[PDB]
Nucleic acid binder design. Structure first.
Length: 275
RNA sequence: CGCGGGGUGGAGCAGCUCGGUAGCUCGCUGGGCUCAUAACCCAGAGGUCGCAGGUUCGAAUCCUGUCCCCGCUACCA
RNA sequence: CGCGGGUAAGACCGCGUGGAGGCCCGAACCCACUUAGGUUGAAGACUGAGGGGAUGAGCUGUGGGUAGGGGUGAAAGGCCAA
RNA sequence: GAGAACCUUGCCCGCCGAAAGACCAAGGGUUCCUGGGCCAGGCCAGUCCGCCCAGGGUGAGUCGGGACCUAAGGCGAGGCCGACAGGCGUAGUCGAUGGACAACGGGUUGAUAUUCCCGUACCCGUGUAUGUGCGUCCAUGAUGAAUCAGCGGUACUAACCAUCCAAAACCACCGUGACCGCACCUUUCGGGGUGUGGCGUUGGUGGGGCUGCAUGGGACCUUCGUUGGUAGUAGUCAAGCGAUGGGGUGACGCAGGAAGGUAGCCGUACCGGUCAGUGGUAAUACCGGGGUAAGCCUGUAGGGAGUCAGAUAGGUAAAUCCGUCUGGCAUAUAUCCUGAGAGGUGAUGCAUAGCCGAGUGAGGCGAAUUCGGUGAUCCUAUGCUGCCGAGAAAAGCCUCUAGCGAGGACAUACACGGCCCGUACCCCAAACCAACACAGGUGGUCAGGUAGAGAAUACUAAGGCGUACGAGUGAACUAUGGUUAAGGAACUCGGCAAAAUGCCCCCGUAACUUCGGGAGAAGGGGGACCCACAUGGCGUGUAAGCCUUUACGGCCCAAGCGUGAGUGGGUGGCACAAACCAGUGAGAAGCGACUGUUUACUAAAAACACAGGUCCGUGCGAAGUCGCAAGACGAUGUAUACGGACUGACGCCUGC
RNA sequence: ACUAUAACCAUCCUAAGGUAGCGAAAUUCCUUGUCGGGUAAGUUCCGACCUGCACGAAUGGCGUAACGACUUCUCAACUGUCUCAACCAUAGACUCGGCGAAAUUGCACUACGAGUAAAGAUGCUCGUUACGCGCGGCAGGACGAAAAGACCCCGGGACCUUCA
RNA sequence: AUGGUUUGGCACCUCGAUGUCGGCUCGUCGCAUCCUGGGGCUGGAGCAGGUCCCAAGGGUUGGGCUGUUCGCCCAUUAAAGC
RNA sequence: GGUGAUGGCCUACCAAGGCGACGACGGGUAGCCGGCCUGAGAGGGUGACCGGCCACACUGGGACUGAGAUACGGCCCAGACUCC
RNA sequence: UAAUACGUAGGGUCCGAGCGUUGUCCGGAAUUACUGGGCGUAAAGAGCUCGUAGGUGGUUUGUCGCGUUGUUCGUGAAAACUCA
RNA sequence: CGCAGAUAUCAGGAGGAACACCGGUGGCGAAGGCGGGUCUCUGGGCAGUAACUGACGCUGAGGAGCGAAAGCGUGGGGAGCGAACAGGAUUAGAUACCCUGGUAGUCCACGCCGUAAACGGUGGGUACUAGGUGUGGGUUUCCUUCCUUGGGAUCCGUGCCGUAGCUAACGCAUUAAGUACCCCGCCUGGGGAGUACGGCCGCAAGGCUAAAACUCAAAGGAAUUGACGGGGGCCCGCACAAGCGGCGGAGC
RNA sequence: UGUGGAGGGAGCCGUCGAAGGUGGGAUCGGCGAUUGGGACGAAGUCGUAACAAGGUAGCCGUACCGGAAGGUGCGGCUGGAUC
RNA sequence: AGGAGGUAAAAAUGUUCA
């Protein structure tokens, strides 16, 4: 859930934090911990490509198994539920009965001791991973592959889920969290249930420093930049831009999806706005 | 420092010069409906955007002084 | 968190423990608000006196990266070897 | 000395003393030391010098680095991409600011010292010798295994049974492709219409034997598995090293105390010594000392950890290792590990206050060295607790087997090798960056005392400076400080600047409030010294006592040491937070919510950011961005995410 | 129905005609608006009115506790800020010794008045005044020094914007 | 008609620099005299004035508001000069 | 200790209690009663004369004297007012 | 414009050294209802429950005698009121 | 809205909300209120038995809880409906009725709010006082078909009617507004005003508590008679309709 | 026998102490530019909300909107007419 | 006796004492 801080400081007035309640262990599993280093939003050239990134608390990568293909029929038990800074969701440490230890996305309803099944002959329970050919319609799923073997791409964030609407042929229709309906090969695998830590959205981070810890550098508005820096720049006194809204590189608002894409035929219905 | 700008029946608005300026709504007058307004009928009536000048025959109409409430008047050092 | 009160159980109240905080005062440290001086300076941007922050969006060392219509910029058109 | 304010010596005085002391790094590069010099330099002079000349000087297995490890990042075989140039990047290889790794004390020189010497250690390697001593070949065991037939289950399919289905199938029905009878009606008749008997059942309907399809149950041979011994033989294993591989560790944040300790400091037993020409003070006073490391022992406080057996392939192969699962056994002042520190040893040494003469400085002798107290920002501690923002890798070490394997392990003694670079000197500065011997800047380590909360501030020790133009002189004037009658903002754009407030403990504290604050609100009172309460209380803790598992045990505890706080009484002064240090406060409005950021060098702000909000985009090598492209960031993320725009806590709202 | 305004109405145009709330505002020219408060006296400040030159709802509106080296106003205390200035010391200034620059500089035994003049004269005219040379001081002039005026214009650039 | 202080007109020196308003300080000058002084006329009874003439010796306040000059106001003054 | 006398009446110490919705503490008003007026009575209102009690004597405070003191025509102080 | 309601006259009436008015209190007012009210629509049933304090309490035996009741004593000053 | 292929029709899909018929003077609940089905958990009631305790009861100031709808917050969702809003229409004007759309909201989760014609405008408990008639739940019993919602007796409910009694009347009338007891809440003329000030609660909206000045001589309740109705029913009239002829326009 | 000694007093000091002063609050009123609503008023303006189905039945609560009555939505009541 | 639903669109006001 959520712990609302008390207003002992102005940087804590309306602030909130997670009550790390479904979490059981403060420490991660060392074998599954790869290192990480910040980039600063900078690429191989050393140049800012994505702005508003840097500083940030040090982090370490928990090796998640988004590709749960090699443990079919080999059950596991959720040994722990842990915090992952790399993602909004929490992560569940599973002990496979063959001795393999792995991390997953920690769906809702999942606790220590819950037994996780993988494969076609698995039960339709939270945390169980199956092909969509074996998952029935109207089911709530997460961590879906876009391609067989490609690994889970979809419905990975906290509180989020995908609704499997139907299967017609070798294509399963999926209502996505954005509302977009799209087709995906039934061979693609999905984890049953909805992702946990859905309370995450309702956190008030209270102060600038907290997002500086999360690695979000300050976002400056164009209207207070100079015209050399931003199209919206300039003006004596405040301005609304002096023109229609654009990016700092002058690209206007509007659809940036490349047309004539391969996914256009798999997509059934783009998401909706305003309604 | 300096520049600018439409006027028309009682009110509000239209109408650019083949030779008239007028038309709409409201208002007003007379009648009717009602026991007595509004809505109906009109014989309905109603004005020279003020004078000067046109090439004027004649200009509300075009041009200048005036006709004058007019949006913008702004010398930035 | 504990104790006590209270309750049907609570919410809640009090006492303690506990030691949070872009919390307070204030040295180092970092800044640079005011003022005086300097203004052929002691100094190509300082001194003195006060001043602000001072566990944090902190300061700092070492090493490294981004390069010119480009970088970087909590955005002043500021900085990129006076 | 030719020459002296400046050089040398001595004595005074003064300054710093979280530094103006001591040590490093970076940087500089010989500036270090000795000797000599003095036309340049030094803001004067100069006998001096960081200046000039010459000569000398930097000694490491353990320090800091390489030979060990990797991070960011860089180069980058091949490679990909790119018109060429080249951009990226894999494997790799570099790359500390980090990881790992063995040393401490004292002495010495004119200059070096964890480097040399002395003493005592430690870490790698090497050879020889010796001894315990397992092993191979001998022997020894642990051993377990392929053949056959007997039996329980695969049940080729010969088929057996059940369930389901109709390929075709008898009967009657609905009306019939058209026609063949009976019957009735219609444009004037014609080309038509209605009920039904047969034909075809175009098709559909309801009961039915049969047969043929599919599924399941059993199940011959075929075939899998347990006994029957040839064959506990062919075979394996049993020293040790063991990985370039597997696994574990290495391996990590921030804050916060508390506890135990130590250094350090203050005293003190004890030792040695002075009389510092003053009124008193000979021991009763005063001064000085009142030390000694690593390492080896020990293994305390604190902290941490279940163990044994079996099974298992998950860890590219194998694993006795790691995981995982099963059980059994334990909840232990048990065991193990870690570990400050105490104590012992190191140390019959070394060092020292001082004493002897010697006086350039060569030496020589050398006392006591107990008790407490206080007390760290250091150690235990990479701990413990808590929290979220969720906190490097690799080597190394350990282990596993694969593998190697006939010699090998361990111990002792002796003898040996331990490489390269740095090491002088300055290092908050006169030696670095600053054009200067520049009031600037420069990261880290030591952190004495008395007061004090304190690393502030004052004074001071050790130690180091008086830092390089001076001597004078009551001018104005300027600067910096100081004081000021009466008044008290009248000054002035403006209370600018100054002044004031300022500490501790008590009391008491408003509007408003987001209930946290406002608030140190405001506004007041006390504060010194002496005595007594007080041989008190508190802390500590000795002796003594008590208990015990007997030890580095515990409890208590006279004394001793330290130490407040308060009450009462008294004393003195103008004054008691006496100096230094050290909030001014209140009301109201505007702006911005706030902490922060900003125009290095005239603007710190109402500007930026901020959390929060809305909109838009993005379905994922996304969108967006750097790039010609590859590729990269985004993101090792996946719409509760990411990017862009505007707004900018919060409240009421956000109309056309 | 006194007056005043105008709840109300008519008409024209519009895509729609500014709602809530605010309002001489960081926005109000007129303007020191008017009224009130505070003051002895207040172009500032506070409150209020609304005749909004030219507020206005995320270029957010109206408020807001707390915060602010912000801005504005007031008050207490405090004071040399002032009435109104005096005194002391120190560092300079001054003197002696020593070293020893600088910007600047067409010259020079470089007066004042009233004039004249490229219209503001040390330098010209007519007069007046003035022994020569220094030292400390003040800063009225030398249109003083410095910087080939940044304002203005002309010419040319640069960067920025855009339905060039 | 004076004067040359206002707003201006001209654009004559100065754009290889003539620094601007207001205040502070220091003043100096003129008189077109605010006070003080002398006087004429008066619709000057007296007090007090009005107007004109002569007169520039001296004096000509402190505050609130405003950057302000100016102005308004407060108290005063012999007067609160231009 | 003090009183004439009991008692926090006062004091040192000790304990932490005491009062409050049955209205504490506060605010307002008021001298109380016998009685008076009204009213069928209950009740309501009132507190003049007369009589009893209390309180006060310019305001506030204080004691002294005395058997006895709010000591009107007594004292002390302070304050306001009036007068020399 | 025909006033028994105004003003005046007569006349009448109620009081009578008084008469009227005003003010205040009670009554009437069963209009805060104890005696002595009410709450469907007149004002009035809490939106409904739970339940604290409180109020209230079925049948019965015994007891206490608190309430209650009887009696007596003392007091209830005098004056008042009432009776004579 | 369509003519860019709407409406309509067929098929498929998505999603939301509400649950036709059953379903009513019916049932349950303290009230609010509760209606698709199933499961789970759970509360209350009624009858019978009379085994148990043995007056433990009733009410309940304050207080606490529950408390329709709207509304508020946060987060989802959002088909239909739909304040506001926008057009259209009507209208003298129409910020409305009507139409077309349509936002919040209605929905879910957690919480605030705490009101309503929250009404039976009727507080709770108990006892008694004529009956009739329906209906719901349960117990029994008698004709017996031994069929049996055939009837009766009784307890609990819920309705209609009707006595006595009560009531101003309307009406209530064994589900009292009767007869009586206990307890609570509330009233004391209408306005001002359930408003201000203060306080409490609340994010807010607002709620709760709750006046005074001033003002009126009434406000009110029930019922009667009339009148009236853009209420109804029945009936008439040159009233309309069907016709004929005129007036209004000319002159007099 | 003596300016003797208890003892007492003046004076002085101290506690308490009125008045006074300082301070910050509480509480009760009055005024207050402007401003809100309430009551009354001949005869004024705008509309017609309610009473008859008052011409959209009204009213309760809530919310929103609107010159004003008021309108609309949600839920509720009948103190609602016709059949 | 037995048995669906309807339509009238809008259309205001009324000085005096009474």
């Amino acid at each position: 859930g959520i712990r609302k801080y008390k207003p002992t400081t102005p940087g804590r007035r309306g602030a909130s934090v997670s009550d790390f309640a479904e979490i059981t262990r403060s420490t991660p599993e060392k074998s599954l911990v790869r290192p990480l280093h910040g980039k600063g939003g900078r690429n191989a050239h050393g140049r800012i490509t994505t702005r508003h990134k840097g500083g940030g608390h040090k982090r370490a990568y928990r090796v998640i198994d988004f590709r749960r293909h090699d443990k079919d029929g080999v059950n596991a038990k959720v040994a722990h539920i842990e915090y992952d800074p790399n993602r909004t969701a929490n992560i569940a440490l599973l002990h496979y009965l063959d001795g393999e230890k792995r991390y997953i996305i920690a769906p809702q309803g999942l606790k220590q001791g819950d037994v996780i099944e993988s494969g076609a002959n698995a039960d339709i329970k939270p945390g169980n991973n199956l092909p969509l050919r074996n998952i029935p319609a109207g089911t709530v799923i997460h961590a879906v592959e876009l391609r067989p073997g490609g690994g889970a791409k979809l419905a990975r964030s906290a509180g989020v889920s995908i609704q499997l609407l139907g299967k017609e042929g070798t294509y399963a229709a999926l209502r996505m969290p954005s509302g977009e309906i799209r087709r995906v090969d039934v061979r693609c695998r999905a984890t049953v249930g909805e992702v946990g830590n859905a309370e995450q959205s309702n956190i008030n981070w209270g102060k600038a420093g907290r997002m500086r810890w999360k690695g979000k550098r300050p976002t400056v508005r164009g209207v207070v930049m100079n015209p050399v820096d931003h199209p919206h720049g300039g003006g004596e006194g405040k301005t609304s831009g002096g023109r229609h809204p654009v990016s700092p590189w002058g690209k206007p608002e509007g659809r940036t999806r490349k047309p004539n894409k391969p996914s256009d035929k798999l997509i059934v219905r783009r998401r909706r706005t305003g309604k």
